[PDB]
Amino acid sequence: MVKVTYDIPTCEDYCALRINAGMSPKTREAAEKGLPNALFTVTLYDKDRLIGMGRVIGDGGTVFQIVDIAVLKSYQGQAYGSLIMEHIMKYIKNVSVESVYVSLIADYPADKLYVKFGFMPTEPDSGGMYIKY
Amino acid sequence: MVKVTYDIPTCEDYCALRINAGMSPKTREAAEKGLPNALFTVTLYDKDRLIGMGRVIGDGGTVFQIVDIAVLKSYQGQAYGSLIMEHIMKYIKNVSVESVYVSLIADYPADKLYVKFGFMPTEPDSGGMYIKY
């Protein structure tokens, strides 16, 4: 019986959850700097354990990016990613207007989840590019 | 020589620059809501005309997205995109730490600009996905 909260997770839990979800690691320093500064955060807990999260960055009008959609491996494929996204999309729908753009960077196995929410690839017209420090 | 500014653009100048850079328009409503809320904005002016801009959204530690890289069609192909990116990369360098991720969405020829600054494709393992309202 998982609980939905809008609480920001601890740095330790955030970092560990990314690893558990097979995402690129983040340092505690990066987490300390970033966690307080999302537009919106959703965290899922099973008792006191963080089992999933999602975050949004953006400018509140013209552009948003959904980031850090992460679910523990043992909890995957059971609807928790959709629970996270449902709340994220509720947030974005309350702020978005005509011409607002929302995007994300999806690892290929994640495409299925995001497709449920109406996302489509930017390719072939445009592609993600990145750097890591 | 162009004047470089980190000031908030006007809604008119922003919307006008998007259109005249050959990008999809933003409504003035979206611009009004979005413009104050980027982490960083650089604007280039030729005398009293806005000719270029770039913006950054993010959480200040873990993730940033570079957005709205817009240079007038009539000013393209001569280093102004690079000038914008130099100022953006300066901003990110002063806030980024080990593990910070920065991404963007680029079409073709545009990818040639970002490659100069060390950006590489997310594809094939990861891809941009979007919704537009």
Q: Measure the CA angle with vertex B105, ends B72 and A64; round to 5°.
A: 100
Sequence-separated (6 or more) residues with CB below 8 Å from residue A15:
A25, A26, A27, A28, A31
Distances (CA, A) of B43 to A100, B14, B28, B85: 21, 10, 18, 11
Taking the CA of residue B9 and the nearest CA in chain A, the distance in Å comes to: 14
Among A residues 45-84, those touching chain B with beta carbons less than 8 Å apart: 55, 57-65, 67-68
A111 SS3 class: helix
Find the radius of gyration of the CA atoms of chain B. 15
Tell me if A128 and B126 make a contact (CB, 8 A cut-off).
yes
Compute the distance between CA of residue A34 and CA of residue A51 in angstroms, rounded to an integer: 20
Candidates B71, B124, B70, B128; CA nearest to B104 is: B128
The residue among A29, A111, A129, A130 with the most chain B CBs within 10 A of its CB, best to mutate, is: A129
> What single-letter DSSP state applies at residue A40?
E
Domain ranges of chain B: 2-133
Question: DSSP characters for A43-104?
Answer: EEEETTEEEEEEEEEE-SSSEEEEEEEEE-GGGTTSSHHHHHHHHHHHHHHHH--TT-EEEE
Nearest CB to B123: which of A38, A127, A131? Answer: A127
- Give the technique used to solve this structure: X-ray
Taking the CA of residue B43 and the nearest CA in chain A, the distance in Å comes to: 17
Q: Is B109 within 8 Å of chain A by CB?
A: no
Asked if A75 and A66 touch (Cβ cutoff 8 Å), the reply is no
Q: Looking at beta carbons, which residues of chain A come within 8 Å of B96? A: 133
Element (H, E) at B35: none
Nearest CB to B37: which of A27, A60, A131? Answer: A60
Per the structure block, which two tokens stand in for B117? 């600054």
Asked if A65 and A58 touch (Cβ cutoff 8 Å), the reply is yes
Tell me if B104 and A63 make a contact (CB, 8 A cut-off).
no
| Cβ-based neighbour number of residue A65 at 10 Å | 25
Q: Measure the CA angle with vertex B101, ends B96 and B105; round to 5°.
A: 120
- HSE-up (13 A, CA, CB side) for residue B110: 20
Sign of CA dihedral B25, B104, B115, A34: positive
Q: Amino acid identity, residue A27? A: T
Q: Is B7 within 8 Å of chain A by CB?
A: no
Fold classified for A2-133: Aminopeptidase (3.40.630)
Q: Beta partners for B129?
A: A104, A121
Taking the CA of residue B1 and the nearest CA in chain A, the distance in Å comes to: 30
Element (H, E) at B82: helix B80-95
**Cis-peptide into A124, omega within 30 deg:** yes
A33 SS3 class: helix
The residue among A18, A59, A115, A120 with the most chain B CBs within 10 A of its CB, best to mutate, is: A59
CA torsion angle for A48, A56, A125, B83 (degrees, to 10)?
Answer: -130
B102 SS3 class: strand
Q: Amino acid identity, residue A12? A: E
Q: Looking at beta carbons, which residues of chain B come within 8 Å of A122? A: 105, 127-130
Query: Least CA distance to A101: which residue of chain B?
Result: B132
Query: Least CA distance to B101: which residue of chain A?
Result: A132
Compute the distance between CA of residue A30 and CA of residue A109 in angstroms, rounded to an integer: 26
Per the structure block, which two tokens stand in for B2? 């162009």
Residue A4, φ and ψ in degrees, nearest 5: -85, 130
CA B43 to chain centre: 10
Burial category of A26 from C-beta neighbours within 10 Å (exposed 0-12, middle 13-18, buried 19 and up): buried
What is the bridge-based pairing of β-strands B126-132 and B3-5?
A: unpaired
Q: Looking at beta carbons, which residues of chain B come within 8 Å of A127? A: 105-107, 111, 121-123, 127-128
Q: Give this entry's resolution in angstroms.
A: 1.7
Find the radius of gyration of the CA atoms of chain A. 15
